[PDB]
Design an enzyme around this catalytic site. Structure first.
Site, PDB file in Angstrom:
ATOM      1  N   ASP A 229       7.173 -10.420  -6.051  1.00  0.00           N
ATOM      2  CA  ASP A 229       6.513  -9.343  -6.198  1.00  0.00           C
ATOM      3  C   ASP A 229       4.980  -9.389  -5.085  1.00  0.00           C
ATOM      4  OD1 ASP A 229       5.341  -6.996  -8.509  1.00  0.00           O
ATOM      5  OD2 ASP A 229       3.644  -8.000  -8.055  1.00  0.00           O
TER       6      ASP A 229
ATOM      7  N   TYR B 143       1.040   4.791  -8.459  1.00  0.00           N
ATOM      8  CA  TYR B 143       0.402   3.744  -9.374  1.00  0.00           C
ATOM      9  C   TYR B 143      -0.500   3.109  -8.792  1.00  0.00           C
ATOM     10  CZ  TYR B 143       3.444  -0.573  -8.769  1.00  0.00           C
ATOM     11  OH  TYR B 143       3.482  -1.267  -8.174  1.00  0.00           O
TER      12      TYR B 143
ATOM     13  N   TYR C  72      -4.639  -5.120  -3.745  1.00  0.00           N
ATOM     14  CA  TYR C  72      -4.204  -4.013  -3.180  1.00  0.00           C
ATOM     15  C   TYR C  72      -4.757  -2.958  -2.809  1.00  0.00           C
ATOM     16  CZ  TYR C  72      -0.470  -4.059  -7.732  1.00  0.00           C
ATOM     17  OH  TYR C  72       0.681  -4.844  -8.382  1.00  0.00           O
TER      18      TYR C  72
ATOM     19  N   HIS D 129      11.709  -5.859 -14.062  1.00  0.00           N
ATOM     20  CA  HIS D 129      10.730  -6.678 -13.108  1.00  0.00           C
ATOM     21  C   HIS D 129       9.964  -7.748 -13.371  1.00  0.00           C
ATOM     22  CE1 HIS D 129       7.507  -6.969 -10.037  1.00  0.00           C
ATOM     23  NE2 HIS D 129       6.545  -7.306 -11.463  1.00  0.00           N
TER      24      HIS D 129
HETATM   25  C1  1LF Z   1       3.333  -3.201   1.452  1.00  0.00           C
HETATM   26  N1  1LF Z   1       4.061  -1.901   0.494  1.00  0.00           N
HETATM   27  C2  1LF Z   1       5.065  -2.625  -0.853  1.00  0.00           C
HETATM   28  N2  1LF Z   1       5.994  -2.328   0.115  1.00  0.00           N
HETATM   29  C3  1LF Z   1       7.084  -3.164  -1.550  1.00  0.00           C
HETATM   30  C4  1LF Z   1       7.904  -2.687  -1.029  1.00  0.00           C
HETATM   31  N3  1LF Z   1       6.592  -3.736  -1.993  1.00  0.00           N
HETATM   32  C5  1LF Z   1       5.337  -4.209  -2.435  1.00  0.00           C
HETATM   33  N4  1LF Z   1       4.792  -5.063  -3.393  1.00  0.00           N
HETATM   34  C6  1LF Z   1       2.959  -4.843  -3.916  1.00  0.00           C
HETATM   35  C7  1LF Z   1       2.855  -4.675  -5.050  1.00  0.00           C
HETATM   36  C8  1LF Z   1       3.357  -5.481  -6.043  1.00  0.00           C
HETATM   37  C9  1LF Z   1       3.530  -5.207  -7.513  1.00  0.00           C
HETATM   38  O1  1LF Z   1       2.615  -3.525  -7.886  1.00  0.00           O
HETATM   39  N5  1LF Z   1       3.046  -5.637  -8.118  1.00  0.00           N
HETATM   40  C10 1LF Z   1       3.743  -4.972 -10.161  1.00  0.00           C
HETATM   41  C11 1LF Z   1       3.725  -4.107 -10.426  1.00  0.00           C
HETATM   42  C12 1LF Z   1       5.336  -3.916  -9.988  1.00  0.00           C
HETATM   43  C13 1LF Z   1       6.544  -3.863 -10.839  1.00  0.00           C
HETATM   44  C14 1LF Z   1       6.175  -3.085 -11.923  1.00  0.00           C
HETATM   45  C15 1LF Z   1       4.761  -3.227 -12.403  1.00  0.00           C
HETATM   46  C16 1LF Z   1       3.852  -4.154 -12.005  1.00  0.00           C
HETATM   47  C17 1LF Z   1       1.921  -3.968 -13.205  1.00  0.00           C
HETATM   48  F1  1LF Z   1       1.587  -2.915 -12.089  1.00  0.00           F
HETATM   49  F2  1LF Z   1       2.133  -3.275 -13.847  1.00  0.00           F
HETATM   50  F3  1LF Z   1       1.873  -5.581 -13.041  1.00  0.00           F
HETATM   51  C18 1LF Z   1       5.111  -5.068  -5.928  1.00  0.00           C
HETATM   52  C19 1LF Z   1       5.517  -5.463  -4.571  1.00  0.00           C
HETATM   53  N6  1LF Z   1       4.211  -3.490  -1.897  1.00  0.00           N
END
Ligand code: 1LF
Ligand code: 1LF
EC number: 3.3.2.10
Lengths: 312, 312
Positions: free
Chosen positions: B99, B147, B230, B288
């Protein structure tokens, strides 16, 4: 360094400073010292290719310091060090000790050879327990260890050592030629510092900043825990006697110091009877405080041994 | 395990759980997780012959959690992880991330290859920054990452996630077929849990005791630190653009999960353009929360890779 903490019992947590990668090397300090006594060895051994775990021994620094005497018998202390390895997921480690830590590592090697890859002691010899002589009769035959009798009565040595922390460490941590203390006269005089300077000078071995580190460490728990290491003579003797006749067959190093007038080199003379393949180092012009007195020599000896005899 | 603490800055101390001996493997969790998310990997990797360092990432658990947004930009986070290695006396470590931790390890590999022995990511692909498109325009082109816009305004997501900790973790930590949340509809709905159950059932992936561990960890600092990861989109983009065109040449593994509906396997399809010798794993029926959804599969993939491609 990294500060590591291992819970070996619900109320006992052991602290260590960690540096380097490679085979695990656990350093065990003496009385009344600190992980910080290994300050010169930690970077040198790490640079040499070893993962260093420099302990605060039970009773010291950031490690747990319960008041109970029985918490500091050698059997308990060694068992906890085994649990320490278990919690870290280490099958084995090299154990290097000085002073009381030297005694501990010998008993680690003796009772837990499967967990000790190799063993080294600075100053402290391995002398098998004598089942026909009580610990008190062993002092009655050795005027050199009489100061330990002064350490027996709970509260007494605590009060003297804690009265003025700076004075305590400045008086203790000195080269042999700078000595202000007579260890063979302590119990008769009724104290360590009764006849020594009120404001001792700074030894060539240490800076003011180094003394103040020890001061701050012992501000936390005082000397009760450390002194309790001395107050288990009968228990330690009884445990040690269970291993009568058995030999230490893992790689072993004994390092003697010419000018340690308590732990004299001659005390180690018979060790080969019980440790057939023992290797030796010897440091000239070196007093009791080996690591800080002759850091360059200690580093040389340990690294030479670790890179050769200690490997298999 | 041992609890380790590394001071990387006067006010920033990083916590990790340490187990095993051998080559150093640093595990970096995602949002909103814990070193504890690696609970199944830590003993397996240690048993496999590795020294495991499972991080509490900055903002989480026992690690420092300053309130300032800029403290959580990728440049700072990566620099701190380099200092982390420095303090531990480690020349290199294998970095494995999931993640947000996956994003971090890619940038560790990209900007500090001399300190990264090998790199692996679960779910998170490596997509080079686009200098011709602002971070906001990248969301404007991807309804899947919308989100994250809800996470932008300080205080808002903090309040929702902290309102009922048990509900938060029970709602999040679910297999894909158990999902109660619509990630593609969050920003329109004005929250993660506005339309999800008030008292969610327990997922097959987790026990009540496991949920309560996360609850207790987030009782300590809440979600401000975690959410601040974020809130550095512009900073991270500008830093990432400095490495335009450069390739990752160290051993690398990308592990995709069939049922991660946010970080879809297809997102990783072009990675070979920038990581020529990339190796891959793929987990079927996996959502996930990879490590706890398919622990046996994750262990198999990581160990196979660590014992082969990751070595040189
Ligand atoms: C630079 N932008 C970017 N690009 C990619 C391809 N990935 C990412 N990241 C960072 C953020 C991260 C993220 O939001 N995790 C939380 C989360 C992921 C999935 C499903 C629920 C959730 C949650 F929010 F519910 F915890 C996922 C990986 N960022
Ligand atoms: C089982 N009896 C036994 N036998 C031997 C051969 N050694 C030991 N030990 C444990 C006690 C330990 C000790 O007293 N350290 C302190 C100290 C040593 C020197 C000079 C000043 C000092 C002091 F007390 F000032 F710190 C010395 C090693 N015990």
């Amino acid at each position: 360094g990294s500060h590591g903490y291992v819970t070996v019992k619900p109320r006992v947590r052991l602290h260590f400073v960690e540096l380097g990668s490679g085979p695990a090397v656990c350093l065990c300090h003496g009385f009344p010292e600190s992980w910080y006594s290994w300050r010169y060895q930690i970077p040198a051994l790490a640079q040499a290719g070893y993962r260093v775990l420099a302990m605060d021994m039970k009773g010291y620094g950031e490690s747990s310091a319960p008041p109970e005497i029985e918490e500091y018998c050698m059997e308990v202390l060694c068992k906890e060090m085994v649990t320490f390895l278990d919690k870290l997921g280490l099958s084995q480690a090299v154990f290097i000790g000085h002073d009381w830590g030297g005694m501990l590592v010998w008993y680690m090697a003796l009772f837990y050879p499967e967990r000790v890859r190799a063993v080294a002691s600075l100053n402290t010899p391995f002398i098998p327990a004598n089942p026909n002589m009580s610990p008190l009769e062993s002092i009655k035959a050795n005027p050199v260890f009489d100061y330990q009798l002064y350490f027996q009565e709970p509260g007494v040595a605590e009060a003297e050592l804690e009265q003025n922390l700076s004075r305590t460490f400045k008086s203790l941590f000195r080269a042999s030629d700078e000595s202000v203390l007579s260890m063979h006269k302590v119990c008769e005089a009724g104290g360590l510092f009764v006849n020594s300077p009120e404001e001792p000078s700074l030894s060539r071995m240490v800076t003011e900043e180094e003394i103040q580190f020890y001061v701050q460490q012992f501000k936390k728990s005082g000397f009760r825990g450390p002194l309790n290491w001395y107050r288990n003579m009968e228990r330690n003797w009884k445990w040690a006697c269970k291993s009568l006749g058995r030999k230490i067959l893992i790689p072993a190093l004994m390092v003697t110091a010419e000018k340690d007038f308590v732990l004299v080199p001659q005390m180690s003379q018979h060790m080969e009877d019980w440790i057939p393949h023992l290797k030796r180092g010897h440091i000239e012009d070196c007093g009791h405080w080996t690591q800080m007195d002759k850091p360059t020599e200690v580093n040389q000896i340990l690294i030479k041994w670790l890179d050769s005899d200690a490997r298999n």
